[PDB]
């Protein structure tokens, strides 16, 4: 369980962001114990951040293996009273953590927090807290590296100078402290540890059926309160298990979002929720959010700014969805990793709906003898489905309650047309609607294959998102060839019934390139590229959604496609509007978010 | 007036506000209606820290005059109220009001220095909201200065304005807001550490830190000092407010390779560590002297300004920042118009990084007929009383740093004309009375027809020249522009007294190009940097050069502002021109101490 820190009448909130002490590990740092002392001859590296951009220097961009973060932490010793938690919101790849060269605990997975309570008796007068960072990915993370020294993106070989992670994946593989550590306190002998709510809707009426997780002995009150401060429903020794009611609820709409503030208190302890009422379901070819059919209109997004990379960067966030409603969009999807908490908040509190995806990209062995993706472990298959059955388990357990999550993505462009992929996939389906109370729709994000109809997303999703790239990477400058071949496809999918959508399309776009005839590259390329595309998808009627590749051009690993970085946003890195963010601001200003195909 | 800066110690909770709060413009009625009494009604949500001009798609919010109120709430433990609770404002540009539930607790004027307040304990409540209603209007009584007519500081014919808007005297976009973070912070009630003030002294061989530690109430003060890796090398319990203490193997701070010892202090329950380093500075003839030795000045003015926060504090471009400064071979950098956040102070200290600190004080100007520093009862300037004030917080807060080395007491003021002299000599008297290290003082001087009137001759340290010799005069003629640049830096190293470059450059926007001189090109700024290197090369008193500027950046809108001020050797997102290569060559060939 993994409640928000939040500043409460009974839990202090200490943020410890800020300049940390920084060394790279030269393959002696565990064996000399750094943690036991001050780092040595050291850099600074802000926290929160992804350390790879921030200095100037190659190596460290391109450094294998660990890294050590330090600071100080001298904290007041009235918190002893307290009990005293340690939470980082994410890490990436892996980390040590250390008190006074005691390690605390350990975590494997880059993009989902985790946290440990400081033991009384470990903390001193003065204290060090370091956590050691692995940046190192293979055949057994998420994502996926690739262990053969080849690029996923040479023309004659080559030996590398230094060993270097290889991403099986299109994106730099940022690392480091990439959002906020902070202490929080609760109270020692009760206190709350987890919150599940879910709704139905009876006429006007909404029922809010509660489960309230808390360690110790205490009695257990729960309140519902409006944004302005009116209490609309309370029960009280209600125990964990529970209902009520608000009369006349506020729904939560898309870009008319709602939050009530849920006040819930064990004992000492007072956590306050805040919580959207909404319905999502699937019925026929309909997504349906509050009983009425919706159109996705958004991106696939990353959580991508210069210098911090990946690290958190709350005014960037901001305005990235000051630009969405700019633009009209209503709706994105977190590929290929859970986003911070603050954005998901931010959406459920901005009204805009997210497609929640898990960490499991580049589960493909194929994208001495020839091995398959999903070959037996001993054979020589992937390594990753039990981390990606722990992946999905503490992303629903972080997200379960956001109003603005209506679809959990279970894998992109895993190798989901080969045999033995039903196989892997079935158990993790299994495992997220076991455990959504919500009972949202599941999808994995199909990869563009020649045997599509082989695609066991077809026994497995509830909605088929559909990455392809018709006039990009096939029938490129061929915008016709690509009209034909898109239509062939997509009628299929469109046969079976089922809502499908685009979850990636476009095509790299330089800024400041032009050309009035047809030339990759180009502005004006990207938009007929687009114009094509919905030339199909608008005549087809089980098509629910469109999110294009990508919201804004961000960075990737070097290689002879990729113009410093994956370039199809439709905003450059520092959010200026190309001619195609101003061609989908005109398309949907004129598409409504429900009943465009009712 | 002290303000250490806020720290997490053993008796000492720190607790950041940032996040997300919310957000109304004032429509005239937001005090008439006391919007501070409720939650916001119909409000919007912006990220704090933040300027809030630009992280929407609003002209009417980015170009908004008056008030807007920002909220949130704050719930925090009963046993918080055992300890002193204290609301620090790191910074609010310009002007704030800060309510709790419905209570004014204080008003500040001045965008970019810190400000707090005691929480009264009587007034925490169960649930408690915490508004901040901040203005951002300039005038003649501000500082920066706002023009009173409707003149812009960049018309060809005239019109009659939409809506009333704020008209800088100065060339940089005026970013309102929450700028820097706002803390709870707790400190113990009944004894506690109030400033430190620490002095070093060099002479005979011996290395020594004077300490001066204020407190409020009744206890006993100890003081030890630590190397970086936990060494205690001099310490005293039971001691006095002052006093001294010998560092045995001492290690200098120096430009561009930082030494920071921690002085731990305690008074009571109570605990503050603050880091140190230990330097000398002096000017004497014409050389300015870092730890006796005479320096050389490499680096910018800048301006704190990133995408899409504004003027907001920004943690990893202040670390990009200077980790581009070490690549290019900069040792220094002017805190061009504005103090900068602590945060920046405190990791330049870290990273060896030279300082010139400089007040808010820019467009004190009237005349880019009143003249500027005629009395106030006939239209004169109004910002003397607030200059003082500045000076006093600036020094106050900063006087610790290590790397700050000059104090800036004005950037371009009519420093040529009647009056000037009798306006500023209280402001240096001020400053050298202040800075307990006694640190060098100028100010930045405008260029101007008779430099040879300017006061700054009569009051500063260093001579810290603007001169634009081949952009706002000689444009493309730089044949022209080396001539002229001889001639009046002639004069000014005729005096004798170390001068330099505060500001020099020529707009110049990425990717333009031409091999013949032609303005705005990338050639032409390598082109410009040269000619006046032809000059500054062969003068001995000149000491120092700091471009115009580090990296493009945000102003008003005008006929001569491509999207911004394009003088930046790097763009707004930090890539490197043509100019800021040629620099990193130059810049790798001349020493930090003795090249002239
Ligand atoms: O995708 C990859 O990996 C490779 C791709 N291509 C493509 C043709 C670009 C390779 C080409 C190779 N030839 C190399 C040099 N030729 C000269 O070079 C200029 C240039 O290519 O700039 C042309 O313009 C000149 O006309 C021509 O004389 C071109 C072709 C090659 F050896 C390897 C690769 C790859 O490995
Ligand atoms: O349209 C024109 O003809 C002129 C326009 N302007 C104004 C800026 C519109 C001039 C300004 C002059 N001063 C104004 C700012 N001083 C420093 O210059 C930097 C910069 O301007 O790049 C600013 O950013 C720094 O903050 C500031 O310290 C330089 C001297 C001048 F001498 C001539 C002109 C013109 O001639």
Redesign the interface.
């Known amino acids: 369980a993994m409640l928000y820190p939040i ?13 940390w002490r920084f060394k790279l590990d030269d393959g002696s740092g565990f064996e000399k114990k750094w943690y036991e ?2 780092l ?1 001859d050291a850099q ?3 926290v929160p ?1 992804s350390y790879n ?4 220097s190659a190596d460290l961009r391109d450094h294998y293996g660990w890294v050590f973060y330090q600071r100080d ?6 918190l002893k009273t307290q009990r005293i938690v340690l939470r980082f919101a994410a890490v990436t790849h892996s980390a040590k953590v250390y008190v006074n060269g005691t390690l605390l605990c350990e975590h494997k997975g880059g993009f989902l927090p985790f946290e440990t309570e400081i033991p009384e008796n470990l903390i001193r ?2 204290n060090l807290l370091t956590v050691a960072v692995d940046n190192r990915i293979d055949h057994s993370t998420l994502p996926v590296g690739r262990e053969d020294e080849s690029n996923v993106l040479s023309f004659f070989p080559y030996t590398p100078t230094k060993k270097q992670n290889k991403p099986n994946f299109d994106f730099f593989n940022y690392c480091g402290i990439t959002r906020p550590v902070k202490l929080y306190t609760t109270p020692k002998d009760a206190y709350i540890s987890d919150i599940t709510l879910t709704s139905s809707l009876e006429n006007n009426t909404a029922r809010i059926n509660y489960k309230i997780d808390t360690k110790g002995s205490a009695h257990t009150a729960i309140g519902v309160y409006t ?3 009116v209490c609309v429903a309370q029960t009280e020794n209600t125990g964990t298990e529970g209902s009520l009611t608000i009369e006349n609820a506020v729904l939560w709409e898309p870009l008319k979002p709602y939050l009530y503030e849920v006040k819930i208190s064990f004992g000492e302890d ?1 956590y ?1 929720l805040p919580y959207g009422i909404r319905s999502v379901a699937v019925k026929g070819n309909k997504f349906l959010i509050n009983n009425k059919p919706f159109y996705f209109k958004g991106y696939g997004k990353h959580e991508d700014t ?3 990379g990946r ?1 958190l ?7 990235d969805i ?2 969405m409603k ?1 633009q009209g969009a209503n709706s994105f999807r977190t590929s290929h990793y859970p986003y911070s908490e ?1 954005m998901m ?2 959406c459920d ?2 009204g805009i709906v997210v497609i929640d995806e898990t960490t499991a990209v580049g589960v493909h062995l194929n994208f001495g003898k020839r091995v398959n993706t999903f070959d037996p472990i001993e054979q020589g298959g992937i390594r990753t489905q039990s981390h990606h059955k722990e992946v999905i388990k503490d992303l629903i357990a972080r997200d379960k309650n956001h109003a603005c999550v209506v679809m959990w993505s279970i894998a992109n462009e895993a190798d989901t047309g080969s045999k033995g992929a039903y196989e892997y996939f079935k158990p993790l389906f299994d495992l997220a609607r076991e455990l959504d109370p919500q009972k949202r729709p599941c999808t994995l994000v199909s990869l563009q294959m020649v045997n599509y109809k082989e695609d066991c997303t077809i026994k497995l999703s509830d909605v088929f998102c559909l990455n392809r790239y018709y006039g990009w990477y096939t029938c490129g400058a061929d915008l016709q060839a690509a009209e034909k071949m898109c239509r062939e496809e997509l009628e299929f999918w469109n046969s079976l019934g089922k809502p499908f959508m685009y979850t990636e399309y476009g095509a790299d776009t330089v800024m ?1 390139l032009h050309d009035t005839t047809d030339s990759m590259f180009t502005e004006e390329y990207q938009v007929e590229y687009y114009k094509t595309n919905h030339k199909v998808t608008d005549t087809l009627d089980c098509f629910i959604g469109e999110q294009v590749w990508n919201f804004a051009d961000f960075a990737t690993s070097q290689g002879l496609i990729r113009v410093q970085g994956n370039k199809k946003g439709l905003f450059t ?3 200026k509007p190309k001619l195609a963010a101003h061609y989908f601001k005109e398309r949907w200003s004129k598409i409504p978010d429900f009943g465009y195909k009712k």
Not at 53 to 56: A, L, S, T
Not at 313 to 319: E, Y
Request: glycine share 6%; aromatic share 4%; proline share 7%.
């Open positions: 500043l409460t009448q009974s839990r202090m909130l200490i943020d410890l962001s800020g300049t002392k001050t040595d600074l590296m802000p951040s951009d921030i200095k100037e932490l001298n904290i007041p010793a009235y007068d003065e944004k302005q401060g007072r306050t210069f210098p911090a690290g960067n709350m005014p960037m966030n901001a305005k000051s630009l700019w603050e908040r931010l509190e901005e400041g890195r520092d959010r």
